[PDB]
């Protein structure tokens, strides 16, 4: 799991 | 005689942010922010303070997540704890800054700026004036109690590690921190301030006052936001919207 | 809170 990509998808 | 510091407290102190580095980083950021803006789009004092507070919150999150004990919780637990206390930590930070760095009739900012009460008395509205008035009352109280850095860091941990938040998974770690930090704080006050027989209790009674002021601050900010006064992409607003 | 998650999990 990559925190940055998760954020970009979820924001 | 000699001062005594519980080992635990030494461990907490080690987690403290590098104050001069934070100050320089935040000031440089705000100066660059304003310089990047043309004459007509310059931030107001309020706009700058909103960005300042945002940067301070960023610093608070980085303090927590690098902190002993907290960094061992799952992210979901970390989020629940910070969602609960983010504004209290901002307030405690501000209050303590005044206790250590503040001078009569002025307020000291994270950037090292100093703001004369009179400047506020004139340009601030009643809402902010009321807020600052309550904050100043707590500052006077804490100065009177000889609130110090060791007690400050214990209170930060006690505010962060709240047992009053719903659906905490690792509640045993949270219980552990509450139990041991309370104990170390009590030992510290008894040993080092023995003439103030109820210092421990007196410090704890400041916590609901910190909560009250933090709620008032949240309310003021939310109102400013509803009026369209808060600059875009504010992390404080995201914490509010949650 | 996506931003909070990110600041912690990163
Ligand atoms: C309380 C501790 C936090 C830091 C206090 C800083 C004092 C700054 C005073 C500067 C000089 C001044 O007087 O600035 C005045 C400005 C504006 O004032 P106004 O009343 O909103 O509008 C003016 C009155 N009108 C609208 C009726 C015309 O105020 C500020 O920029 C205060 C910024 C507050 C902190 C940023 C948000 C923090 C939210 C925290 C919630 C978790």
Spatial contact of B229 and B46, defined as CB atoms under 8 Å apart: yes
Residues 6+ away with beta carbon under 8 Å from B135:
B91, B94, B95, B98, B213
d(CA A4, nearest CA chain C) in Å: 7
Q: Which two tokens stand for residue B135?
A: 């904050």
Calculate the CA B146 to chain-centre distance. 18
Contacts of C7 in chain B (CB under 8 A): 58, 61-62, 65
- Say whether B111 counts as a known binding-site residue: no
Q: Compute the distance between CA of residue B16 and CA of residue B149 in angstroms, rounded to an integer.
A: 10
**Strand B106-108 to strand B114-116: parallel, antiparallel, or no bridges (unpaired)?**
antiparallel
Nearby residues of B37 by Cβ (< 8 Å), 6 or more positions away = B43
Residues from chain B that touch C4, judged by Cβ atoms under 8 A, are: 61, 79, 82-83, 238-239, 242
Residue numbers in B near C3 (CB within 8 A) = 235, 238
Distance CA B73, CA B69 (A): 7
CA distance B122 to B142: 27
Tokens 């590690």 belong to B161
User: Which resolution, in Å, applies to this structure?
Assistant: 2.0
Q: Alpha-carbon distance B52 to B105, whole Å?
A: 22
B103 contacts: CB under 8 Å, gap ≥ 6: B114
Give the number of other Cβ atoms within 10 Å of residue B47's Cβ: 18
Looking at the CA of residue B135, tell me the nearest atom of ligand 1: 1
**Environment class of residue A10 by beta-carbon count within 10 Å: exposed (0-12), middle (13-18) or buried (19+)?**
exposed
DSSP result, B90-129: HHHHHHHHHHHH--TTEEE-TTS-EEEHHHHHHHS-HHHH
Quick one: residue B106, left, alpha or beta (phi over 0 = left, psi -120 to 50 = alpha)?
beta
Ligand 1 pocket, residue B138 CB under 6 Å: no
Q: What CATH number should be reported for the domain holding residue B15? A: 1.10.565.10
Ligand 1, atom 5: closest residue by C-alpha: B132
Measure A3 CA to nearest chain C CA, in Å. Answer: 5
Chains touching B, CB cut-off 8 Å, 3+ pairs: C
Q: CA C7 to CA B226: how far, in whole Å? A: 26
Q: Mark yes or no for CB contact B239/C4 under 8 Å.
A: yes
Distance CA B181, CA B11 (A): 11
DSSP B196-225: STTHHHHHHTTHHHHHHHHHHHHHHHHHHH
Q: How far is B66 from chain C (nearest CA, A)?
A: 9
> CB–CB of B235 and C5 under 8 A?
no
* Alpha carbon distance C5, B54 (integer Å): 16
C-beta of residue B217 within 8 angstroms of C-beta of residue B49: no
C6 touches B: beta carbon within 8 Å: no
Range of the domain at B224: 1-242
Q: What are phi and psi for residue B137, nearest 5 degrees?
A: -60, -40
Chain A interface includes C5 (CB < 8 A): yes
Residue B150: how many CB atoms within 10 A of its CB? Answer: 20
Q: Which residues pair with B107 in a beta bridge?
A: B115
Contacts of B227 (CB under 8 A, 6+ apart): none
Asked if the Cβ–Cβ distance from B75 to C1 is below 8 Å, we say no
Question: B220 a known binding residue?
Answer: yes
Helices assigned H by DSSP within B36-170: 45-65, 75-101, 117-123, 126-144, 149-160
B50 lines ligand 1 (CB under 6 A): yes
- φ, ψ of residue B198 to 5 degrees: the values are -120, 25
What's the domain count of chain B?
1
Decide if B212 contacts B130 (C-beta within 8 A): no
Question: B224: closest CA among B236, B210, B209?
Answer: B236
Q: Residue B28 has which token pair?
A: 């440089």
């Amino acid at each position: 799991e990559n925190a940055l990509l998760r954020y970009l998808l979820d924001k | 005689a000699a001062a005594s510091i519980p080992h635990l407290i030494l461990e907490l102190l080690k987690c403290e942010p590098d104050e001069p580095q934070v100050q320089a980083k935040i000031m440089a950021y705000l100066q660059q922010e304003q310089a990047n803006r043309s004459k007509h789009e310059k931030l107001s004092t309020f706009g700058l303070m909103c960005k300042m507070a945002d940067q301070t919150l960023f610093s608070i999150v980085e303090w927590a997540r690098s902190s002993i004990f907290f960094r061992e919780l799952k992210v979901d637990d970390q989020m629940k704890l910070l969602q609960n206390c983010w504004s209290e930590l901002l307030i405690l930070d501000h209050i303590y800054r005044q206790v250590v760095h503040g001078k009569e009739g002025s307020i000291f900012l994270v950037t090292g700026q100093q703001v004369d009460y009179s400047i506020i008395a004139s340009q601030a509205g009643a809402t902010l004036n009321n807020l600052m008035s309550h904050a100043q009352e707590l500052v006077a109280k804490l100065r009177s109690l000889q609130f110090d850095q060791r007690e400050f860091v214990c209170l930060k941990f006690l505010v962060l590690f709240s047992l009053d938040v719903k659906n905490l998974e690792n509640f045993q770690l949270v219980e552990g921190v509450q139990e041991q930090v309370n104990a170390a704080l009590l030992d510290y006050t008894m040993c080092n301030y023995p003439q103030q027989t109820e210092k421990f209790g007196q410090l704890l009674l400041r916590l609901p006052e910190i909560r009250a002021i933090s709620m008032q601050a949240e309310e003021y900010l939310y109102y400013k936001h509803l009026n369209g006064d808060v600059p875009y992409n504010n992390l404080l607003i995201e914490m509010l919207h949650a």
